[PDB]
Structure formats: C-alpha cells, structure tokens
C-alpha cells in the first residue's frame, strides 16, 4: 500500500503524541492489545482468530465458526468476555489499581456506537491508532508475524485442531516474547516519526 498524504500525517502525528507521552511516563505495562486474523483449513474454509494480549501473555481469544465475521454485536460481547478474563488473570486490574489502556485498530466494528459505549462503560483508555498501520500494532508486527511462519507449516483438518494448535503455541512462548512485543512500541513510534509517517525498515 502506498500511503497518501493524509495517512502519513495521521501516522506521524499519532506516533509523536504516543512517544511524548511515553517519555513523560511509560504506560506500556498497562496496554492490552488485540486484533483479528483468518486461519485457513480444508474440508476452502477459514476461521477468524480474535485475540487479546499484554506483556504477560494471551488474556483471551475466540476462534469464530467457519466463515463467520466480527460485527458490532459480536465485538461488544467479546470486549465484555475479555474483561471477565482480565479480572481473573490480571489482579492489578481486578483491584482497580490500574486502568486498562486498550490498543486496537480502526476496523468499523471496533468504532461502532455500541462498542464505543461499551469501552466507555468498561472505562478503558482507548489509544489512538492510525489507519493502515499494522507496523504500529503489536498483534501484527509481533504476534501474528511469529504465528504466521508456524501456521504456514500446518494443514488443519478441523476447527478444533486449530484451537489446540493455538493453545499450545500461545503457551509455549515465554513471558519474555510477549514482553518484547509490547516494549518494541517506542522504537517503532520513533522510526515512524523519523520516516515522517512513511513505512519504515
Ligand atoms: C484503514 C484500512 N483499510 N484497510 C486497512 C488495512 O490496514 N488493511 C491491511 C490488510 C493492511 C490490514 N488490515 C487490518 C485490518 O484490521 N483491516 C480492517 C480495517 C479497515 C479499516 C480501517 F480503518 C482499519 C482496519 C489488519 O489487522 C492487518 O493486519 N492488515 C495487515 O486499513
Ligand atoms: Mg485488524
Ligand atoms: Mg492485523
């Protein structure tokens, strides 16, 4: 994708804001992030992985029934279920000592009215994210980057072989892999600013 002027300006401006905040007070340990990816399996079928994670590991994921997509109502329900997982797996959040900072992309179901309401009610801080920026999304440049290489060697048979493969694959990564993916953010933000909003190396 060739970025246009509007897109590069939004990327640079978003990265400046995040980087300057980071420099005043790091917030990276409070980020919960997530994204969707298709995973394919032959009987020409596919299932959507929806996953959320932080520097400690995977919090919650869903594998959708073959062919089914995330819409506004599904995403709202996912966020509610994710919050239940976060309470159970992240004590700093159950106790309200620590506000969730949520990083997701601008997919329409992510910004629909009902979802925006639900995020306000959960009262997670929603981080700015520019369009066409998977290079700035940890799920894309870290998690799915690693996962995609391993996936390419699989030939899944069933929706439940996928679920087991993901359970094992997620659990086999050490805490340090998750930590690195999140703490790569500031170096990425810096590169984007130095690129003036272009894609970078
Ligand atoms: C804008 C815009 N339009 N297409 C895109 C885009 O970024 N596409 C590509 C396939 C780069 C992409 N996309 C998403 C993603 O979620 N796409 C749905 C979405 C739609 C609109 C919107 F504003 C943001 C996101 C990924 O997660 C991802 O990894 N990639 C690689 O960005
Ligand atoms: Mg996405
Ligand atoms: Mg993505």
From Swiss-Prot:
Region feature (Catalytic): 5-201
Cofactor(s) annotated in UniProt: Mg(2+); Mn(2+)
Entry keyword set: DNA integration, DNA recombination, DNA-binding, Endonuclease, Hydrolase, Magnesium, Metal-binding, Nuclease, Nucleus, Transposable element
Binding-site list for Mg(2+) 1: 35, 105
Molecular-function annotations in GO: DNA topoisomerase binding; double-stranded DNA binding; histone H3K36 methyltransferase activity; histone H3K4 methyltransferase activity; metal ion binding; single-stranded DNA binding; single-stranded DNA endodeoxyribonuclease activity
Binding site for Mg(2+) 2: 35, 140
Enzyme Commission number: 3.1.-.-
Primary location: nucleus
Top-level taxon of the source organism: Eukaryota
GO biological process, one term: DNA integration
Cofactor binding note from Swiss-Prot or TrEMBL: Binds 2 divalent metal cations per subunit. Magnesium or manganese.
A GO-annotated cellular component: site of double-strand break
EC class (word): hydrolase
Subcellular location(s) of the protein: Nucleus
Residue(s) at site: Important for base-specific DNA-binding: 149
Main function: Mediates transposition of transposon Mos1 by a 'cut and paste' mechanism. Transposases are sequence-specific nucleases and strand transferases that catalyze transposition through an ordered series of events: sequence-specific binding of transposase to the terminal inverted repeats (IR) present at each end of the transposon, pairing of the transposon IRs in a paired-end complex (PEC), cleavage of one or both DNA strands at each transposon end, capture of target DNA, and strand transfer to insert the transposon at a new site.
Record note on quaternary structure: Homodimer. The complex has a trans arrangement, with each transposon end recognized by the DNA binding region of one transposase monomer and by the active site of the other monomer.
Protein name, as recorded: Mariner Mos1 transposase
Organism: Drosophila mauritiana
Gene assigned in the entry: mariner\T
Shown segment, full-protein numbering: 122 to 345 of 345
